[PDB]
């Protein structure tokens, strides 16, 4: 069966995962049919991106998600949408963008002067 898996990238103690469509038999770090997303658990909130157009196609043809990929598809709303259930908007959290560096430079200029 063709499945949607996490493949491990990154270095020791820094697991970064790509969301890939691959045959069940293929080894984890093996050739993938498509990369449809990425998942970085070490972040807060863990980084999640999914190409929803491709996720819908692959679930349509019958790709079977793995357990963690199924959790991610529910957060993104791609699972609920594919099935017809509600919640398609999803509950995806995004990291608050840190203050821009230029603005903090202006802040320091004003503060001291």
């Amino acid at each position: 069966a063709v499945k949607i898996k996490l493949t491990r990238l990154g270095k020791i103690r820094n697991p970064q995962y790509r969301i890939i469509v691959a045959d069940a038999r293929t080894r984890r770090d093996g050739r993938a049919i498509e990369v449809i997303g990425r998942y970085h658990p070490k972040e807060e909130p863990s980084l999640i991106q999914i190409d929803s157009e491709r996720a819908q196609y692959w679930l349509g043809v019958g790709a079977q998600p793995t357990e963690p990929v199924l959790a991610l598809l529910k957060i993104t709303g791609d699972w609920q949408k594919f099935k017809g259930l509600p919640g398609a908007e999803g509950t995806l959290k995004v990291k608050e963008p840190k203050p821009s560096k230029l603005d903090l430079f202006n802040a320091a200029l004003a503060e001291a002067e």
Partner: protein
């Protein structure tokens, strides 16, 4: 590693001021040792080599790290000599020296290494840390009243502060508006000889 041996003998061999406040250099501007007076045969290689030695023993960078700096400078789109100089100028121990909070680049290194500075609110004790545009460098609370740093506050004036740096507060807060262009950088060295040395 670091070079921790005598500092004057290096400036004496190279015939130029590295610390620039050194009385023992001006007293004996000839190279060190028994034969330091004797006539040395000229060669282009010795000239190129000594310009490299002036660079790396001014900033306190080992040859391994300095050669990586060269490759980056040559890779960068500008002219290699300007890129190399401003990369070494971006070093945090150098920025601290240019700001005035230290007496010597050796003193600047020790301070940064011992954990007295913060960059954009995060502690950095890496002397080779390269500052970028709009970096803000601050002093931790414990080291603000620290006796040599107190000296540094009321010893402002030893050297001039370059335009890309700016000390804005009595907290001794350093701002970097940009990386220095070659004109901004003022160093007793001919950079074109080092580019030629590594093209050998």
């Amino acid at each position: 590693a670091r070079y921790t041996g005598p500092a004057t003998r290096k400036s004496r061999r190279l015939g130029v001021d590295l610390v620039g406040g050194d009385q023992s250099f001006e007293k004996r501007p000839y190279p060190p040792g028994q034969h330091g007076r004797a006539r040395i045969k000229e060669s282009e290689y010795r000239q190129q080599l000594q310009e490299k030695q002036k660079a790396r023993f001014s900033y306190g960078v080992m040859e391994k790290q300095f050669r990586r700096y060269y490759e980056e400078a040559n890779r960068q789109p500008g002219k290699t000599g300007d890129n190399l100089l401003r990369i070494l100028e971006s070093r945090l121990d150098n920025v601290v020296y240019r700001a005035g909070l230290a007496r010597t680049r050796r003193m600047a290194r020790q301070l940064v290494s011992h954990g007295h500075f913060l960059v954009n609110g995060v502690k950095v004790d890496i002397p080779s840390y390269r500052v970028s545009q709009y970096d803000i460098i601050d002093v931790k609370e414990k080291s603000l009243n620290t006796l040599p740093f107190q000296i540094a506050r009321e010893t402002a004036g030893e050297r001039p502060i370059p335009s890309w740096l700016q000390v804005v507060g009595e907290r001794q807060r350093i701002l970097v508006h940009q990386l220095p262009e070659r004109a901004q950088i003022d160093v007793p060295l001919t950079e074109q000889l080092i580019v030629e040395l590594y093209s050998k």
